[PDB]
Design a protein around this ligand. Structure first.
Ligand code: 3EO
Ligand code: 3EO
Ligand code: 3EO
Ligand code: CL
Ligand code: CL
Ligand code: CL
Ligand code: CL
Ligand code: ZN
Ligand code: ZN
Ligand code: ZN
Lengths: 195, 194, 195
């Protein structure tokens, strides 16, 4: 069912300047936004109109947006989780409600990697890959077979440079951060379309 | 016998434009090229006129050339291998025929690390070093004592931040690849051998 | 702890790049630990007795950008992963520790003050482990005793499964053994003030 492809929209130049100005008037499209500070790149996934990514990529940094920089609405260092108001045009994934243990991690290179959930915030890859297959995909989505968000990719367990299992912030942890709330900008340099 | 030294030729700014334009009018020299996207760096080894490197660094990107960007001539994801037409000026290594297990790995820093081959695509360092010695040297060559290409550095077995063994695409897999068949990757430096 | 810290960014990537090329940094220098960068990677440097020390695996044999142009290395020790420059005017200097305490504190680029238990000449254990990301990019940062004196600089970490448990450092002694025995410039892009 689940397939994906990537689209690069900027170079490092556009990125650098966008970061400095915090002003991105490119058209936002897709559910998964390929994201970057000037010095490191990772993914940001959208759920419930909020654009979620990891703190170990974003920091407390703002998001470059059409009317200037967007301050983080949510920030949870303990859960390695931040979130901005999703910019106009960005599609939002719906949270999973079926309880499927068969998860699908989508990577920055638009690979769809099977995972079996074996814990609340953790699961094993059905076939190990070199860690390069995952690196730079933090803040990417884990999807159930219906393509609903179960959680966002946070870390991976590896040995001898081969990743055997993953760690993610579940979608429930987001609801808990959301309720509990109640120099450079991060830049959208591409996206990953789903289906 | 084997020795090697490095030469940088571009800054990151130079690299950024050369990447976007896709046009590199610099003089290509050496057998091993220090290569970079705008955002990561590794190596590319030339063998029999083909300029090889790793997919996990270069993706499916073109290579900035003196008459515009050059499209990958080979792309084997499963082996983590990509190849371009070697750009004019580059020198080319010849595959090893002597079957030696005494390999020698050349790094981006130009260190010549002795490796004992212990499998088709696998070998051990005679004395371990910190992973930082190797990191960024994917696409670099592993050389027999006579200075010929046996393979191409791909990944490393490390623990506690020290590298003990390596994994490399053998020069035969390249022959199999050859038989079967936004930004450009940029040459920002090179490594001269002897 | 009597020891607390915060960081100040002073440059961005474009600013860093130019300054690397020129090797001329006219920015006013402050604090003991300097956030340091080549164009393509970033780490830390610590001042002890007028000498600004960092890791070779970050700086190599690069000059340091200075107010009257680039500063050649005063000490280089690749066996120990150690390099040092004359501390540029403005830079405050920590003092070597003499109490022989084993209750060390690692300071990171994100201004975290991590407890460590010295368990060897040049090695220690984190009192409570953390994800490796907490340490990455903090090489050349200070390990301090309870009195805020230097015992050594952060060099490497022992990790498994993405969690850092122990660390490896150059002792301050080894620097005194270096002191007796003996294209781009590295650029300061921020600092970390201690107390
Ligand atoms: C308790 O739950 C967790 C659980 C985890 C926590 C945590 O995970 C960070 C993880 C640990 C480390 C890691 O997994 N390995 C070394 C193993 C090999 C690589 C595995 C491949 C991919 C991994 C997803 C990934 C990644 O792609 N990152 S990335 O995109 O490349 C990038 C650096 C942003 C550019 N994540 C990641 O690589 N890294 C950090 C922190 C926090 N860090 C900080 C600051 C100081 C950086 C604050 S919080 N917290 C946590 C909490
Ligand atoms: C079956 O044989 C192999 C066998 C291996 C395969 C594979 O190896 C990638 C390897 C696994 C990981 C790794 O070794 N460690 C974590 C251990 C610590 C570091 C050891 C130091 C240096 C290592 C050589 C090195 C390196 O220098 N890389 S690099 O230059 O710095 C750089 C990021 C590109 C800039 N290689 C590398 O670091 N990494 C990838 C893929 C493919 N990946 C993909 C995409 C999605 C990225 C497609 S194919 N395939 C494979 C196949
Ligand atoms: C004998 O004592 C030691 C002992 C160790 C030696 C050594 O260790 C460097 C260590 C080994 C490797 C490592 O620990 N891991 C992969 C594990 C996961 C990460 C742990 C997190 C943080 C670590 C502190 C740190 C760091 O933050 N680095 S950094 O800032 O990000 C950066 C790349 C510079 C930008 N250091 C570091 O990560 N790395 C290298 C060399 C030498 N290297 C060279 C050249 C060839 C590069 C010359 S010497 N020497 C040594 C000597
Ligand atoms: Cl390691
Ligand atoms: Cl800048
Ligand atoms: Cl923090
Ligand atoms: Cl990390
Ligand atoms: Zn579902
Ligand atoms: Zn030979
Ligand atoms: Zn003391």
């Amino acid at each position: 069912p689940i397939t994906a492809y990537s689209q690069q929209t900027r170079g490092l130049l556009g990125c650098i300047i966008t970061s400095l100005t915090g002003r991105d008037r490119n058209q936002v499209e897709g559910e998964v936004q390929v994201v970057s500070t000037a010095t490191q790149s990772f993914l940001a996934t959208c759920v419930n109109g909020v654009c979620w990514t990891v703190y170990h990529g974003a920091g407390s940094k703002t998001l470059a947006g059409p009317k200037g920089p967007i301050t983080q609405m949510y920030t949870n260092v303990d859960q390695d989780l931040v979130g901005w108001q999703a910019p106009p045009g960005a599609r939002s994934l719906t949270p999973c409600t079926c309880g499927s243990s068969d998860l699908y991690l989508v990577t920055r290179h638009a690979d769809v990697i099977p995972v079996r959930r074996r814990g609340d915030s953790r699961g094993s890859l059905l076939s190990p890959r070199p860690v390069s297959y995952l690196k730079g995909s933090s803040g990417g989505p884990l999807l159930c077979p219906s393509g609903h968000a179960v959680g966002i990719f946070r870390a991976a367990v590896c040995t001898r440079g081969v990743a055997k299992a993953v760690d993610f912030v579940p979608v429930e942890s987001m609801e808990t951060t959301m309720r509990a709330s109640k120099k450079g900008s991060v830049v959208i340099v591409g996206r990953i379309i789903l289906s």
